[PDB]
Enzyme design. Sequence first.
Site, PDB file in Angstrom:
ATOM      1  N   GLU A 116      17.060  37.499 -31.014  1.00  0.00           N
ATOM      2  CA  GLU A 116      17.875  37.201 -32.183  1.00  0.00           C
ATOM      3  C   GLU A 116      18.299  38.529 -32.786  1.00  0.00           C
ATOM      4  O   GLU A 116      17.504  39.208 -33.443  1.00  0.00           O
ATOM      5  CB  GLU A 116      17.129  36.424 -33.270  1.00  0.00           C
ATOM      6  CG  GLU A 116      17.972  36.409 -34.557  1.00  0.00           C
ATOM      7  CD  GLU A 116      17.257  35.872 -35.773  1.00  0.00           C
ATOM      8  OE1 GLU A 116      16.041  36.115 -35.917  1.00  0.00           O
ATOM      9  OE2 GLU A 116      17.931  35.225 -36.602  1.00  0.00           O
ATOM     10  N   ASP A 170      12.539  35.929 -32.435  1.00  0.00           N
ATOM     11  CA  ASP A 170      12.896  36.003 -33.849  1.00  0.00           C
ATOM     12  C   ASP A 170      12.952  37.456 -34.341  1.00  0.00           C
ATOM     13  O   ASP A 170      12.063  38.255 -34.037  1.00  0.00           O
ATOM     14  CB  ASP A 170      11.862  35.215 -34.665  1.00  0.00           C
ATOM     15  CG  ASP A 170      12.250  35.075 -36.117  1.00  0.00           C
ATOM     16  OD1 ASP A 170      13.292  34.450 -36.394  1.00  0.00           O
ATOM     17  OD2 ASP A 170      11.514  35.590 -36.978  1.00  0.00           O
ATOM     18  N   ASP A 212      20.388  29.002 -39.401  1.00  0.00           N
ATOM     19  CA  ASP A 212      20.571  30.131 -40.307  1.00  0.00           C
ATOM     20  C   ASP A 212      22.015  30.315 -40.765  1.00  0.00           C
ATOM     21  O   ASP A 212      22.358  31.361 -41.314  1.00  0.00           O
ATOM     22  CB  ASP A 212      20.088  31.437 -39.657  1.00  0.00           C
ATOM     23  CG  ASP A 212      18.587  31.453 -39.424  1.00  0.00           C
ATOM     24  OD1 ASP A 212      17.845  30.948 -40.294  1.00  0.00           O
ATOM     25  OD2 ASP A 212      18.148  31.981 -38.380  1.00  0.00           O
TER      26      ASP A 212
END
Lengths: 588, 588
Positions: free
Chosen positions: A357, A328, A424
Amino acid sequence: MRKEAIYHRPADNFAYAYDSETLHLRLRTKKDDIDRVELLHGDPYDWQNGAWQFQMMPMRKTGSDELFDYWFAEVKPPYRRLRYGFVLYSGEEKLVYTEKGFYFEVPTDDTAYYFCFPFLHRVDLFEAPDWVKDTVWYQIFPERFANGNPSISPEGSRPWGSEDPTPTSFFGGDLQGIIDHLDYLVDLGITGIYLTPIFRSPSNHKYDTADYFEVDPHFGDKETLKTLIDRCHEKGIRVMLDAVFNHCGYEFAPFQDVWKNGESSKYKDWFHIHEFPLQTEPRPNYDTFAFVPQMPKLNTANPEVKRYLLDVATYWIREFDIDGWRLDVANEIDHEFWREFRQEVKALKPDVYILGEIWHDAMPWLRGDQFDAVMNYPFTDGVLRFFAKEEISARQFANQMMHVLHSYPNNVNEAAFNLLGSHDTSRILTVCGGDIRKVKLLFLFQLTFTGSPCIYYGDEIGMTGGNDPECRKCMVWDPMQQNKELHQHVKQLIALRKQYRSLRRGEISFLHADDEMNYLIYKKTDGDETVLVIINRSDQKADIPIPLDARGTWLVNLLTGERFAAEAETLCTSLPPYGFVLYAIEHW
Amino acid sequence: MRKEAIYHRPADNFAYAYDSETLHLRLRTKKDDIDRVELLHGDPYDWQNGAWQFQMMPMRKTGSDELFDYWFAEVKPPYRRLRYGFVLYSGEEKLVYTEKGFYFEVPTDDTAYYFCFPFLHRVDLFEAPDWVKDTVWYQIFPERFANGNPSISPEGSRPWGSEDPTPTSFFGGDLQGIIDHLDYLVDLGITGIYLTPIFRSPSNHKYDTADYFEVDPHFGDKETLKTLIDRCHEKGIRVMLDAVFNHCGYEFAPFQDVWKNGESSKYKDWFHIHEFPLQTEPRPNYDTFAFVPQMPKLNTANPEVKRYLLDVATYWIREFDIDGWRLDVANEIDHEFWREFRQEVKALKPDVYILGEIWHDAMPWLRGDQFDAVMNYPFTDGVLRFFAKEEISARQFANQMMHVLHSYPNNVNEAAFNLLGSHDTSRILTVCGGDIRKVKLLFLFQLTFTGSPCIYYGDEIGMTGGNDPECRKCMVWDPMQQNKELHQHVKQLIALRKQYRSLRRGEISFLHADDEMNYLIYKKTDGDETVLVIINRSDQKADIPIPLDARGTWLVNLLTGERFAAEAETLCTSLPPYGFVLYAIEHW
Ligand SMILES: [Ca+2]
Ligand SMILES: [Ca+2]
Ligand SMILES: [Cl-]
């Protein structure tokens, strides 16, 4: 020739080891400005008769973006050492491009002029786990996949799919529910599952971590997580968890201590605090994810923090046998930490996929010492602009795909995580304005593209919704509400991908049609097989000329199985609105 | 606007942290094609606070090379995070340059188009020891500096400086000889000494190491080395040793074992052997430096080798307190090893200078995780081509210097090892065709240039010789054979460098004169301090116009110390053949 448009520099995507004995070298020039390019190369110490020994190797134009032509060459240095340059030709003009600039003929009195790739070391080679290349991932947001254990659902949980989700609503999804629906994924053809955060946290998304060593009680316990992983393994599915190492949650023990005891807390250096005591008003006096007070940024430079996160990283691998870590907000954590992370993870289990990410250019994290890949959002952007919004032409789409692919080394692209949406982003069907025909094209491109594609839960059955949290609706299990056309389409393409290697690991090339606006024509090839894809991205039927020689050329429709020969030296493909076709090519 | 010549990519020399709170951003464009450039910048998450517009900052043109203009901007992100783009202005039109391409105006939607510098981490910041920035090094080849101990000289040593050196000749130079001449170096102004290999080896250069844990008996003993280093330290002189880690010597015990036992040897994996038994010709059957049989390549990927070499690296630092390690053929050893090397060395003594011997572009080794600097041979070539060989114009020289400097981040250039020659090059006086006037210009440019310059023993007194071994003559100590004028010139310049910070740490800019063929005009700037240098590189008198304005400006001749007010719009200076003058510019 325009010297100001010619570029190469000894690293990243322009020069890298593809394997223990082979180097890949690229050069870019102004599109259509150069006729031929040759790689001049030789071992730095190979001299004879008082002259440096070097050879010339013609380079191949692998593609071009809006501004440049990209050239390619692979070379096996005789002694793993190399000094090289580029010779460009255009009519009677000749240029020798080197580290010391341009010359009009090859200087051989010394090797200092040339670019250098000192030595090919196996240890510095970029190497991602090979299994991901054939994998098709499925992303699951646990709170919304399936309520397999009602007794542990959060109080206040809403009836399944009874209303659109909010930033704080709960529907009771859990780990057991994922176990219960594994056969659905097996049937789909999925061989990899990526789960968003599942460690203890008070939220429905759980990116504000309370305890990295505990499964959230509402999702299950460690025994259940182990059973899930074991069941996936039995069915041939690898499991990747979400590592939220950039920041912790407001309820993380060390942070709670600092919040209460300020500068005297022994955990104060575990964070990025600007002043004591800590506060959230008027604004936080400590770094946070974005501007979210409940998400304090962790100091990954602190020895104790690194030790803790590295322990967390290896713990889940060692004790639960997970197959990957999705990082993340990976780009906001320092490189030093990521290097140690890779060393410890790979030492424990070399097969673990390290996915970062990062929504932007990620070359600095893809040199071989850190990640195996990144969530390919730039690919998402381009594919959606062409197929979903139809904002760019086929010509512009090809250029953008060529642009992003050539920005990285080949082996990096081979392991890329190519997605179309996620928790997202808005739902692809919604980005497509509800047109299933366009979504079908998105899946077709994704599933015929080289790399490790990932499907966001529900997209295969036509779920809708805007951006976070609207894209996190409860999974639709009622067959009467699932779009059957899409589910069959996806299952079909995944099956094809598994059957044709060129789709999974080949090189992609775009062929320019007459109508460079709505017709997309591209090929996938790995040197053994070739698959041609033709797409009519328009609401009108179309007769599309296929640029291919018809001498001993045979085509096989991959969807119908029909075989036929070409003759017009440019066979005509007729497609209905938003139609498409795939052909395996045979040269006899 | 020539889009093909525009370029920026978030890493290396184009985007980097200068310090813990400041980022530097660069952009290159076709020379003279762009009139102005503005940096659009903001925090990636500004949208959460309702800040959807970018902040704007004008970029400054820092220089131009043969083909491009380079723009610069320093930014202090309020929250250490940055999203940015560029706005280029040209007579043709205005264009916004982003990671996703060019747009006629800043996109009004919320799509991600911009470059990104995720977070400014102190741990990833490139940082060389601050002391090197004020250091002027002096390189010594021990076998040829001074015979301070006749009793340990090799058997068969030739009378000191009586004949030209050869690849196998010995004259008896030793460590005591260096100690005996320290006062000479102190008088010169030297604050750093770089010694070539001093560990046991049968040769006169000792790059074919027999034992890394022993000072060659002919050079002295560990007691002598300690005395040398301590005396140096007492005189403010730091000491850097030569680490020959890429390869060992033929007499290195582990290698001797493999050469004797062959494949049965327990040291077989310490090297790069292709077949057994080992052969030395036609070419070795094992990797070596070049193709030298007596220099087998070490396998720095082997755990035992790494431990041995790292023990070596830390031993001399811990036990003798050396201040630097010059890494022989550093580019041929893997990056993984260099990262471990830095970690261990810096943990032991953060002040140790790590200098790699790399003659070409070394960006990959200068990102902060490996070296502090490299021997700047590209600088050597450019400077010699202009001042010594006179093979390029003042304009072309300016371009080349701007080219190599803009290829690296500012903090990397500020620690660069700028040399004019070494034990691996011809003598500068010889390159200058025996013209002392040209050598004086070489020293002038070198000593007013930012970085950590190094002087090759004997160049300060006019020693002559072609390339290796000719450049390794015995040091000339008789003043009657030393060029006094040159020596005082160097002493005077080192004194000035110590007095004016702009010379050692400032930015450089070239002012283009009318006759930009032989006249070189440049300035060093650090805050309001400015040093203007004017060089007449021609063999005849010349009157060169000083562009500077007289607006309350005063000039100080740094050679004579004379002060005077600026005349009108441009003051003229008369210089003799190959003459020069330096002026401190004061703004009152
Ligand atoms: Ca439940
Ligand atoms: Ca001696
Ligand atoms: Cl089960």
